[PDB]
């Protein structure tokens, strides 16, 4: 359970980062469409 909490925290941060990056990339691909 102690390890569980560690991993939950770690993957949650990773996902937030990936979503962030994807958001930036979406904007740039959207820009590029023009």
């Amino acid at each position: 359970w102690m390890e569980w909490d560690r991993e939950i925290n770690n993957y949650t941060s990773l996902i937030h980062s990936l979503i962030g990056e994807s958001q930036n990339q979406q904007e740039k691909n959207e820009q590029e469409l023009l």
């Binding site: 990936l18 990056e21 590029e32």
Partner: protein, 36 residues
């Protein structure tokens, strides 16, 4: 190129979300065992 990069980004997010799901499953099984 930007599209292929974006697909990588999405795939990585899906993979990280899968790890999270597997963790939630473990947790549920632990509780279920103690609760029943």
């Amino acid at each position: 190129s930007g599209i292929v990069q974006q697909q990588n980004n999405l795939l990585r997010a899906i993979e990280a979300q899968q790890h999270l799901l597997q963790l939630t499953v473990w947790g549920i099984k632990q509780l279920q065992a103690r609760i029943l």
